[PDB]
Design a protein around this ligand. Sequence first.
Ligand SMILES: *C(=C)C1=C(C)[C@@H](Cc2[nH]c(/C=C3N=C(/C=C4\NC(=O)[C@H](C)[C@H]4CC)C(C)=C\3CCC(=O)O)c(CCC(=O)O)c2C)NC1=O
Ligand SMILES: *CCC1=C(C)C(=O)N[C@H]1Cc1[nH]c(/C=C2\N=C(C[C@H]3NC(=O)C(CC)=C3C)C(C)=C2CCC(=O)O)c(CCC(=O)O)c1C
Ligand SMILES: *[C@@H](C)[C@H]1/C(=C/C2=NC(=C\c3[nH]c(C[C@H]4NC(=O)C(C=C)=C4C)c(C)c3CCC(=O)O)/C(CCC(=O)O)=C2C)NC(=O)[C@@H]1C
Ligand SMILES: *[C@H](C)[C@H]1/C(=C/C2=NC(=C\c3[nH]c(C[C@H]4NC(=O)C(C=C)=C4C)c(C)c3CCC(=O)O)/C(CCC(=O)O)=C2C)NC(=O)[C@@H]1C
Ligand SMILES: *[C@H](C)[C@H]1/C(=C/C2=NC(=C\c3[nH]c(C[C@H]4NC(=O)C(C=C)=C4C)c(C)c3CCC(=O)O)/C(CCC(=O)O)=C2C)NC(=O)[C@@H]1C
Ligand SMILES: *[C@H](C)[C@H]1/C(=C/C2=NC(=C\c3[nH]c(C[C@H]4NC(=O)C(C=C)=C4C)c(C)c3CCC(=O)O)/C(CCC(=O)O)=C2C)NC(=O)[C@@H]1C
Ligand SMILES: *[C@H](C)[C@H]1/C(=C/C2=NC(=C\c3[nH]c(C[C@H]4NC(=O)C(C=C)=C4C)c(C)c3CCC(=O)O)/C(CCC(=O)O)=C2C)NC(=O)[C@@H]1C
Ligand SMILES: *[C@H](C)[C@H]1/C(=C/C2=NC(=C\c3[nH]c(C[C@H]4NC(=O)C(C=C)=C4C)c(C)c3CCC(=O)O)/C(CCC(=O)O)=C2C)NC(=O)[C@@H]1C
Ligand SMILES: *[C@H](C)[C@H]1/C(=C/C2=NC(=C\c3[nH]c(C[C@H]4NC(=O)C(C=C)=C4C)c(C)c3CCC(=O)O)/C(CCC(=O)O)=C2C)NC(=O)[C@@H]1C
Ligand SMILES: *[C@H](C)[C@H]1/C(=C/C2=NC(=C\c3[nH]c(C[C@H]4NC(=O)C(C=C)=C4C)c(C)c3CCC(=O)O)/C(CCC(=O)O)=C2C)NC(=O)[C@@H]1C
Ligand SMILES: C=CC1=C(C)[C@@H](Cc2[nH]c(/C=C3N=C(/C=C4\NC(=O)[C@H](C)[C@H]4CC)C(C)=C\3CCC(=O)O)c(CCC(=O)O)c2C)NC1=O
Ligand SMILES: C=CC1=C(C)[C@@H](Cc2[nH]c(/C=C3N=C(/C=C4\NC(=O)[C@H](C)[C@H]4CC)C(C)=C\3CCC(=O)O)c(CCC(=O)O)c2C)NC1=O
Ligand SMILES: C=CC1=C(C)[C@@H](Cc2[nH]c(/C=C3N=C(/C=C4\NC(=O)[C@H](C)[C@H]4CC)C(C)=C\3CCC(=O)O)c(CCC(=O)O)c2C)NC1=O
Ligand SMILES: C=CC1=C(C)[C@@H](Cc2[nH]c(/C=C3N=C(/C=C4\NC(=O)[C@H](C)[C@H]4CC)C(C)=C\3CCC(=O)O)c(CCC(=O)O)c2C)NC1=O
Lengths: 49, 177, 177, 177, 73, 250, 164, 164, 164
Amino acid sequence: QVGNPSTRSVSVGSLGPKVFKSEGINSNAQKTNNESILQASYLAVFGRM
Amino acid sequence: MLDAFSRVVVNSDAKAAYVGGSDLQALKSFIADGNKRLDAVNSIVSNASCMVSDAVSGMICENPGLISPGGNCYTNRRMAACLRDGEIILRYVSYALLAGDASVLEDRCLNGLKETYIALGVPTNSSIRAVSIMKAQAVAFITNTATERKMSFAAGDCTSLASEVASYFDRVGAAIS
Amino acid sequence: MLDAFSRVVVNSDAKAAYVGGSDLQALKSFIADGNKRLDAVNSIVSNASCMVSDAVSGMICENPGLISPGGNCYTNRRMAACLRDGEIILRYVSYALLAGDASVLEDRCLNGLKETYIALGVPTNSSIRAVSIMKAQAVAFITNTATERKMSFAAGDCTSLASEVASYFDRVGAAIS
Amino acid sequence: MLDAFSRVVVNSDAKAAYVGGSDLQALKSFIADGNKRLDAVNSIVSNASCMVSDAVSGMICENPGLISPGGNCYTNRRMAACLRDGEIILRYVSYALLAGDASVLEDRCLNGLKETYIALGVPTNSSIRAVSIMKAQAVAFITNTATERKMSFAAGDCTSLASEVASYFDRVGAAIS
Amino acid sequence: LSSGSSAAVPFSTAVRFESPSGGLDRYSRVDPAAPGPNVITRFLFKDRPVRRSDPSLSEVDREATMRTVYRNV
Amino acid sequence: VTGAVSSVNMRRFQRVPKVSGFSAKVTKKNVNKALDKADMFFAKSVTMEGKAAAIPYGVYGIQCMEGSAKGMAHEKRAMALSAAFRMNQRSAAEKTGAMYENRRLALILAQNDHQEKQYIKYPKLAAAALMASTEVTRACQRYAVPESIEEEFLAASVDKVNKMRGTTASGVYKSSCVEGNAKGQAEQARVAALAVAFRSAQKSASQFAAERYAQSKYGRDLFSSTHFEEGYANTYPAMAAAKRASSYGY
Amino acid sequence: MKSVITTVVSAADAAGRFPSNSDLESIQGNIQRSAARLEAAEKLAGNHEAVVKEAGDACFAKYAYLKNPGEAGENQEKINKCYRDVDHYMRLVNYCLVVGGTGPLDEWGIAGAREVYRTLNLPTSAYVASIAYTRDRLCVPRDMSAQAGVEFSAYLDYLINALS
Amino acid sequence: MKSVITTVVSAADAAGRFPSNSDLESIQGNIQRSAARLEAAEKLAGNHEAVVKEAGDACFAKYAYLKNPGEAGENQEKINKCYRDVDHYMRLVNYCLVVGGTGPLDEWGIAGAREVYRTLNLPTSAYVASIAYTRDRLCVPRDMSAQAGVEFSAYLDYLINALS
Amino acid sequence: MKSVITTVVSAADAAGRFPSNSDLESIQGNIQRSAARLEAAEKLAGNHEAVVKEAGDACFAKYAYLKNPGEAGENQEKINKCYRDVDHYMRLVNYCLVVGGTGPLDEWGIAGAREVYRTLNLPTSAYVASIAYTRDRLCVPRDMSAQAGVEFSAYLDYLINALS
Ligand SMILES: *C(=C)C1=C(C)[C@@H](Cc2[nH]c(/C=C3N=C(/C=C4\NC(=O)[C@H](C)[C@H]4CC)C(C)=C\3CCC(=O)O)c(CCC(=O)O)c2C)NC1=O
Ligand SMILES: *CCC1=C(C)C(=O)N[C@H]1Cc1[nH]c(/C=C2\N=C(C[C@H]3NC(=O)C(CC)=C3C)C(C)=C2CCC(=O)O)c(CCC(=O)O)c1C
Ligand SMILES: *[C@@H](C)[C@H]1/C(=C/C2=NC(=C\c3[nH]c(C[C@H]4NC(=O)C(C=C)=C4C)c(C)c3CCC(=O)O)/C(CCC(=O)O)=C2C)NC(=O)[C@@H]1C
Ligand SMILES: *[C@H](C)[C@H]1/C(=C/C2=NC(=C\c3[nH]c(C[C@H]4NC(=O)C(C=C)=C4C)c(C)c3CCC(=O)O)/C(CCC(=O)O)=C2C)NC(=O)[C@@H]1C
Ligand SMILES: *[C@H](C)[C@H]1/C(=C/C2=NC(=C\c3[nH]c(C[C@H]4NC(=O)C(C=C)=C4C)c(C)c3CCC(=O)O)/C(CCC(=O)O)=C2C)NC(=O)[C@@H]1C
Ligand SMILES: *[C@H](C)[C@H]1/C(=C/C2=NC(=C\c3[nH]c(C[C@H]4NC(=O)C(C=C)=C4C)c(C)c3CCC(=O)O)/C(CCC(=O)O)=C2C)NC(=O)[C@@H]1C
Ligand SMILES: *[C@H](C)[C@H]1/C(=C/C2=NC(=C\c3[nH]c(C[C@H]4NC(=O)C(C=C)=C4C)c(C)c3CCC(=O)O)/C(CCC(=O)O)=C2C)NC(=O)[C@@H]1C
Ligand SMILES: *[C@H](C)[C@H]1/C(=C/C2=NC(=C\c3[nH]c(C[C@H]4NC(=O)C(C=C)=C4C)c(C)c3CCC(=O)O)/C(CCC(=O)O)=C2C)NC(=O)[C@@H]1C
Ligand SMILES: *[C@H](C)[C@H]1/C(=C/C2=NC(=C\c3[nH]c(C[C@H]4NC(=O)C(C=C)=C4C)c(C)c3CCC(=O)O)/C(CCC(=O)O)=C2C)NC(=O)[C@@H]1C
Ligand SMILES: *[C@H](C)[C@H]1/C(=C/C2=NC(=C\c3[nH]c(C[C@H]4NC(=O)C(C=C)=C4C)c(C)c3CCC(=O)O)/C(CCC(=O)O)=C2C)NC(=O)[C@@H]1C
Ligand SMILES: C=CC1=C(C)[C@@H](Cc2[nH]c(/C=C3N=C(/C=C4\NC(=O)[C@H](C)[C@H]4CC)C(C)=C\3CCC(=O)O)c(CCC(=O)O)c2C)NC1=O
Ligand SMILES: C=CC1=C(C)[C@@H](Cc2[nH]c(/C=C3N=C(/C=C4\NC(=O)[C@H](C)[C@H]4CC)C(C)=C\3CCC(=O)O)c(CCC(=O)O)c2C)NC1=O
Ligand SMILES: C=CC1=C(C)[C@@H](Cc2[nH]c(/C=C3N=C(/C=C4\NC(=O)[C@H](C)[C@H]4CC)C(C)=C\3CCC(=O)O)c(CCC(=O)O)c2C)NC1=O
Ligand SMILES: C=CC1=C(C)[C@@H](Cc2[nH]c(/C=C3N=C(/C=C4\NC(=O)[C@H](C)[C@H]4CC)C(C)=C\3CCC(=O)O)c(CCC(=O)O)c2C)NC1=O
């Protein structure tokens, strides 16, 4: 990031933490993970429940 | 035809009210996500020749009676008119994604499409599977999750455009059936 | 007629697939929503006698050509039939919200409603207003923003249920357009 | 029809009594043992095809003049109508075991059954033996003591529901006696 | 409906001549998904012709239709 | 010889369907006539299988006689064909009102989702399956005989309020309930209805007992929605068979 | 008598089927929801001398034109029979909570009442003010539980929409 | 498509009524039993190619007469169509565990089956010899939970009581 | 009892008509064809224990799976109940050869047989292999006349088609 500022938003893959995306990728395309993303955003801010 | 802006005008004209600040902010959210809407129409149109051949050869891959003798996609004269018909369905959906309203699709493509396929003998169970493969191709190209073609975008959520384009493919499928 | 659970098995039948654990949590989200969905269809059927009195009396003051001599809702026989059809339309939206699918709305009520009204001579401009008045009355009573009456729910967010019931009410207007 | 909840109401209506706590605890232990009632009536319906074939072929096995030329089960037209009647009787006991009351069996089936069978010449003694075989079949399926099939249940004692279905096969056995 | 009608009279003509020709930009009925001609011509440098596809025919396309009527017809 | 080319009105049947504009208006009319006389083939084929229950082994039963005299069968033809002429003289409140009355009753009657799909699309298929369900199981009003004298008074009270829906709202008669349309044509139907009343009492021992249990089912899953109406259908099956549908105003 | 057991059997009888897995699944909702409508049944059993008197004068607060001669309610036995009606209507709601359905209000309370109230020249708007008083005089955590008040005030406004 | 919802909507649609509390009480019972059958539905979808391989040779080892010339399964084309049909019935049991009703079996696997296996001379006790092997090989506490067996074995026995 | 007599009389009873010359001309064919069918009836009536012994052990020579335990023909007291029915079907062929029409096969041996044989798990292909053994054990100059064996095997083909 100090020599490649364009790499922000590029998923590092298996070496970083797991990223989160409210995608909703289905043929009717709705997000199935409204539960878990709320469970994961509580841990990004507070770090626990 | 109408777009997403003049849909709000004709709903407000039925009550003789000025469209004011109480519902302009649901049109300001159309503008503020307007770069991602154009970012997504570009990802469909760049792949649209490969989308209508992965579709109608997957319709043959799941129903081999179309290329049997007497079938709908049997000869060369008939296969070219199905491959033509795939990219008029895909072309009119991308006019409606770019407009944010489906009224160009309902007034110029799905106006008598059912009564034309009845008089031609086009099998309606196989023309749902051609559209519903193309729905799963589009949502994989909006949300950037196609396996054989990866693109590059800025970070941020765009599943509200993949779900709008999936519901335009559920009006093609629910007007011919 | 169909519901939410039977809609996702007639699409898996079309590609001859088992309904495995990829689209089961789309259905497990429907069951956890179930106490909010059942809490909310009670809200419309508790107020449904007043929702048809607030709708068709709003239409006769916006358009006073309906009580004109020779109108649609002119005589006392015709006022009772317009008061009947407002409650037939609200009854089939209430089946669609409870089922989670617009299948019972589309065929048992809306299939043939357009040329019924063409043969009867119902002005179809007025019927879009009186079904959109009830759409505003639905989402006021879902999300508890009704001014004269409040109902006792638990605390939470149900704007997806209010926008789903607004999706059925303008499906009525598209059929009779 | 009526059920176990509706019987208490129409009993208490004649005294103009409110349903208080003197007779709600009979209904409370109806619901608290309600998971064994659904565990009971599932075991009957899961064996209801074999419980007519073990019944009316054991009725002819103890009275072999029924298939003699002149008998009630002589032709294939008449043996099929006894096999039809052997599963209408088992169906309305299943409607009475689930509802917990014998009003769906009495009014819909047994009203005029004895005055039907004496205008058709059905033998009203061997018909009791086909019923009373089925009572012995059912209570070995309630208490899981059938000698050829063992269903998996939880532990406990459910002898009050084997004696209620034995009380339902005698209201039909006294209806045509 | 009034004046602007036809003459039906299928026969109408009366002469047994030798046949003149047609164009080539016609509806073919075999391969109707074809471009044919008018892809390499001076069709590309005219404005494209107006066919009615809308049932409503909005009032700025109504005026744009009749300008083509006075120019071409 | 003339020079006779094929006409402009005859060459237009060879044209391929297009998809929008005025060229979609031709294909919308040609399909809605091809769905109308496919709907007539749907209603004819159902009636030809309900009529195969009155020919149960190959011989014509007593249910499907026409009239008993010499010219008592030809005049049963000549007032069925004028009964269908007055059927399509009703206004739009009766044609569309019977379409939705039949569509409520045909979907109770259906046994699968394919059957209940087709009663929605095809109106004459659903109208000729309400009648074809009742002519098989003999749940009609021309087949039920009252086996009491309170049962005859109970069925006449149901049939008293069915005879006012063949009258209008001000109280004058419709054209829905008409016996005679010519000179002396009413009395020929008086003769033909007294004859088919006599054959209804000539049924078998089990044919009387199957239609006791069929008229109780017909009155309790098509016209009863409470528990007191179920008591008038489970004990008096002749008043449960005089409950007609509200499509025909008889 | 529409209830939750007497409509899944009465629909399985019309097709001639046995009670299936769909039919037993509907009865298990009358195991989970039964503990709240029977919780509101004892509360109406122990308060119906109070709440009927509380709803009776709520009619006479709104309509004071009943008691005048020339108008209707001029004497005593026209007044004490009004408490006879609304104690019946509270009794049928108490019947409705026990069965798990809207059965007893339908065939006993609702059916035919639009002809009885018209022909006897009773104002039908006087009935609905007494029912809607008890829909507002209920506060939910003091009197009963949370899901007992949503059951008890679901039959009250069912009676209100069936009246007018 | 008989389920818990489609019963109580069409019972109210034939009656001409709004959804009342007896209709919503049934959908509450669809919530509680939903954990047991959707555990059985996901167990069947991830195991089915080993289930129908083991069910189909419980027909062809019991009834060894079917591979004589002139019989049902006399060549490998007709044997492969027998495993096609056990896989169609195990797929329709999987849809019945999702909808919670016999509706997928009632319209895609049972209606017309007696009028098809007769006229193509298919032995209907060779299908039931494979469904009943599946119902008896199911041990409860290894394969699924306790009440995931009582939903899975009840839809197998609805297929057995409707075939034979 | 669909005869040539009962067909044209009941069809004349539906119009309410006298027997006309089309009706009498059909009974003239009954005085033409009855010499062949009553010859084949009396050939069957004097040889029936020889031919249902020969038919029924062609069923168990082909379908030897029935003599397994748990199957159909598993003890001796129901193998004897199998030859009871082959004697029952040949007796109904002999009755309908007398009346000249399919009526005794129709309403005494067929009309309800598919409900019964399915419920008692009796294979209807074993019934076909007995009836289609005697159709081609027959040789037309030795056993009866030429036209007596035409009408005898034609009434067996009605029994093969109504079970298949
Ligand atoms: C049989 C031989 C046969 C099939 C079966 C069928 C397979 C199939 N594929 C899809 C999905 C997609 N096709 C896509 C198109 C392309 N992918 C690319 O990356 C390039 C640009 C383009 C083709 C050249 C895409 C994007 C998808 C979506 C899934 C993905 O992750 O890639 C389906 C649809 C699934 C459904 O039924 O819903 C099927 C059935 N094709 C065959 O040839
Ligand atoms: C059980 C009902 C039935 C079936 C099935 C069938 O094929 N025929 C009827 C019984 C039947 N009817 C006749 C003769 C006539 N029937 C009529 C009246 C019908 N014809 C019509 O066109 C209409 C209006 C649509 C009706 C109701 C008429 C006029 C006759 C002819 C009478 C005559 O004397 O010619 C017959 C006898 C015909 C035959 O030869 O089989 C039967 C068996
Ligand atoms: C069906 C295959 C079920 C099943 C049903 C049961 N039948 C039961 C008892 C019973 N069996 C007979 C024998 C009868 N059948 C014959 O074929 C002949 C001979 C021709 C005879 C006599 C009779 C008479 C009875 C009833 C006893 C009585 O009269 O009271 C029975 C209960 C007893 C038990 O199982 O121990 C059942 C459950 N049995 C099964 O296991 C499958 C699933
Ligand atoms: C292909 C995926 C189908 C299938 C298609 C066929 N369509 C044939 C002719 C045809 N298609 C249309 C509709 C198309 N034209 C439009 O203008 C628009 C929308 C604006 C659409 C969707 C029309 C109008 C026609 C007839 C006139 C023409 O061909 O131009 C066709 C040829 C029939 C034949 O000759 O055999 C085929 C095969 N068949 C299939 O199996 C899949 C489902
Ligand atoms: C008032 C809000 C309307 C209006 C309404 C009128 N509708 C009239 C008759 C009518 N409506 C229906 C459809 C209805 N019946 C059903 O069974 C179902 C679906 C299950 C629906 C939607 C029918 C079939 C009929 C005709 C039969 C009848 O009389 O009930 C009507 C009467 C016409 C007249 O006699 O004057 C009126 C006035 N008119 C309006 O413009 C507003 C928008
Ligand atoms: C079998 C265990 C008997 C026997 C029975 C026969 N019953 C016959 C006809 C019949 N049964 C009923 C009653 C039944 N139908 C219903 O709808 C209901 C309840 C809702 C019940 C209990 C009726 C109404 C009828 C007449 C209708 C019909 O034809 O089926 C019958 C046919 C008589 C015949 O054709 O010879 C028989 C043989 N006979 C027996 O041996 C045992 C004891
Ligand atoms: C009861 C269902 C109806 C009713 C119907 C009417 N039937 C009339 C004449 C008629 N019906 C039959 C029976 C035959 N027609 C069929 O469509 C089927 C099954 C698909 C069958 C078995 C016949 C043979 C006839 C001709 C007349 C005769 O029997 O002599 C008819 C017109 C004459 C009349 O008014 O009786 C009607 C109205 N009648 C009713 O009351 C309910 C509504
Ligand atoms: C295997 C245990 C059997 C057996 C089976 C055969 N079935 C044959 C044909 C067949 N089966 C069905 C029913 C099945 N197919 C479906 O699509 C569905 C529902 C979705 C079901 C339940 C059908 C409709 C057909 C005809 C079409 C087809 O061929 O798939 C079959 C071929 C018979 C023939 O020669 O025509 C066989 C051999 N045979 C066995 O050995 C055991 C009894
Ligand atoms: C031998 C081919 C089979 C076999 C035969 C069995 N048939 C059994 C019963 C049965 N069959 C009929 C129809 C037949 N009986 C008649 O009276 C007439 C004509 C008037 C016909 C065509 C009936 C009505 C019955 C039931 C009564 C009876 O026992 O006779 C049968 C008994 C059923 C059982 O034991 O469960 C058998 C055993 N089945 C075999 O075991 C071999 C393979
Ligand atoms: C005809 C030349 C055939 C042929 C015939 C043979 N049949 C032999 C014995 C046999 N066949 C029958 C059945 C037959 N007899 C009847 O009474 C009736 C029905 C009324 C029929 C269909 C019986 C009962 C018998 C045993 C003694 C007898 O009556 O003849 C036969 C003797 C050897 C043997 O049993 O196989 C012959 C040669 N065989 C042929 O090759 C041609 C095709
Ligand atoms: C003429 C043609 C033309 C285009 C094609 C678009 C191209 C385009 N897309 C984006 C910009 C963006 N594009 C995305 C889009 C995506 N990110 C995702 O994760 C999804 C996979 C995907 C779309 C489906 C996002 C999240 C942004 C930044 C947010 C924003 O819109 O400001 C931007 C930057 C806007 C800015 O400067 O902030 C541009 C120029 N605009 C044009 O003028
Ligand atoms: C000619 C003058 C005249 C009118 C303008 C109307 C008044 C009217 N009220 C509502 C609107 C409404 N009407 C109701 C109905 C009710 N509110 C309650 O709390 C009660 C329980 C129930 C009636 C008894 C509700 C809930 C709304 C939504 C707005 C709100 O009140 O919060 C609307 C719809 C707004 C829209 O168009 O989107 C109109 C037009 N009636 C008239 O006579
Ligand atoms: C027979 C009739 C019948 C009913 C009426 C419902 C009654 C009902 N509603 C809710 C329960 C609930 N309801 C809501 C709903 C709402 N909260 C809001 O802010 C919105 C205004 C509104 C819906 C539009 C929420 C957020 C919950 C709690 C979440 C949950 O139950 O999981 C619950 C669960 C109780 C709890 O968990 O606390 C029940 C039983 N069920 C029935 O059987
Ligand atoms: C809608 C579908 C549906 C069903 C089919 C049943 C299924 C079922 N049965 C039982 C549970 C039980 N079932 C029995 C019954 C029996 N045990 C025996 O030893 C006897 C042989 C047999 C009588 C038939 C007993 C004794 C219990 C446990 C105790 C009890 O529930 O009271 C339970 C557990 C209840 C609990 O844990 O509280 C369940 C879920 N319930 C449902 O919801």
